[PDB]
């Protein structure tokens, strides 16, 4: 039972990877669309400890928490339903399958390019079992103007 709406002005995300240019582009887009809350709630980077990244909300400086595990990224944030997977081609599969074991995630945008077709079919099968809608691979993302933008879509 996949959803029929995906992004809104209450939609938050978890960015999997240290992709601070894409996250800053998303936060700048959410400032220029007069949103009241930043659509990136946390970042997940498994190779560094839990800290906070210093980002820009228009003129102001805010702090977005970078976690190490996906579990405590889910535990501190119950409103997150999108995960933007910036992993490589050889680590997008197990990170995506790890994400779909969390119930709040309702859409997963896989940005990676070069995942093998068998692992992608396994991802399609488990996404149809869980009902999570996956954004087709080797994407740039998808932009919903006024509401939400996935990473590097649109551009600057």
């Amino acid at each position: 039972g996949k959803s029929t709406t995906l992004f809104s002005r209450h939609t938050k995300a978890i960015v999997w990877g240290m992709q601070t240019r894409a996250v800053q582009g998303m936060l700048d887009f959410d400032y220029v669309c007069s949103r009241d809350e930043p659509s990136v709630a946390a970042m997940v980077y498994p190779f560094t400890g839990d800290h906070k990244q210093k980002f820009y909300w228009g003129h102001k400086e805010i702090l977005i928490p970078v976690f190490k595990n996906m579990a405590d990224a889910m535990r501190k944030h119950p409103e997150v339903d999108v995960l933007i997977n910036f992993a490589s081609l050889r680590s997008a599969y197990d990170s995506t399958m790890e994400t779909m074991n969390y119930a709040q995630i309702r859409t997963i945008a896989i940005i990676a390019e070069g995942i093998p077709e068998a692992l992608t079919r396994k991802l399609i099968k488990k996404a149809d079992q869980k009902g999570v809608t996956i954004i087709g691979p080797a994407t740039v993302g998808g932009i919903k103007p006024g509401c939400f933008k996935i990473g590097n879509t649109g551009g600057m």
């Binding site: 210093k54 820009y56 003129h59 400086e61």
Partner: protein, 274 residues
């Protein structure tokens, strides 16, 4: 400077500094201006609470920080760091090079019993074991209990600055559990040997952990953060800096000359031909 004053540009700042707003009308310490600091009669314990922990500590704890800086001042010139300060002061250096050259000895063997004696008793108390099992859990791993053990003064011969600190943390000091735990471990280890009283290094460690986690404004994940960061090595270094600068001014006042450490105290053990 003009494209930022009219605000048409962003630049990400570094150096986050949640302490000491220097600019503006008054020097603001953590959230308190300098006139309120001198008006509320807080000593240097209050400004250690403001700079280091960023919380206005209650008046029984600022006086305890002043007390535990008075006892961790000079402990004679034979010890390792004060020896380095004297050696670097007799070589005619500077105040800051002498104090610095002696201060870089404060490590794990010299001056690292404050932090180790707080971490050991906190790991034994937050795990939840009885002291008669803590002593045997130490004894079956090597590792002498840090913070427990004196060379001379223990029992019917007290340390006389463990006693003053202990009287202060019993009178002006509500609900101190880890000190009671550490005194139970002292009750066991002084039954082992007539020595093995609580050190000053052990008692400031456990009384400082109880001061952090037993007063207000620290929850238990800040009172467990500041012990891991090293806010007790800060107490020992800031306390012993008065003793090291005292040794510098003293060796500069006696007009002592350069030290050379005679060769009959050295015993060279060089290889044959290599």
């Amino acid at each position: 400077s003009w494209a930022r004053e009219l605000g048409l540009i962003r630049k990400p700042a570094s150096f986050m500094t949640s302490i000491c707003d220097e600019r503006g009308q008054e020097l603001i310490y953590a959230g308190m201006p300098i006139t309120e600091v001198f008006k509320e009669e807080m000593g240097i314990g209050g400004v250690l609470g403001l700079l280091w922990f960023q919380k206005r500590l209650p008046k029984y704890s600022c006086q305890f920080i002043e007390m535990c800086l008075m006892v961790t001042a000079d402990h004679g010139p034979a010890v390792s760091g004060a020896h380095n300060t004297i050696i670097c002061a007799r070589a005619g250096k500077d105040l800051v090079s002498s104090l610095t050259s002696g201060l870089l000895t404060i490590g794990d063997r010299f001056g690292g019993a404050l932090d180790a004696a707080a971490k050991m008793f906190s790991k034994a108390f937050d795990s939840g074991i009885i002291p008669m099992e803590f002593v045997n859990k130490m004894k079956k791993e090597g590792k002498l209990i840090m913070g427990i053990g004196h060379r001379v003064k223990s029992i019917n011969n007290p340390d006389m600055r463990v006693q003053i600190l202990k009287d202060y943390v019993r009178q002006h000091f509500p609900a101190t559990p880890l000190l009671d735990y550490a005194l139970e471990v002292e009750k066991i280890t002084t039954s082992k040997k007539p020595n093995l009283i609580l050190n000053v290094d052990g008692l400031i460690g456990v009384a400082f952990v109880d001061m952090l986690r037993n007063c207000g404004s620290f929850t238990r994940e800040e009172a467990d953060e500041y012990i891991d960061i090293g806010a007790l090595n800060g107490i020992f270094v800031l306390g012993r800096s008065m003793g090291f600068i005292g040794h510098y001014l003293d060796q500069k006042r006696l007009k002592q000359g350069l030290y050379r450490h005679p060769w009959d105290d050295i015993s060279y053990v060089l290889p044959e031909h290599m």
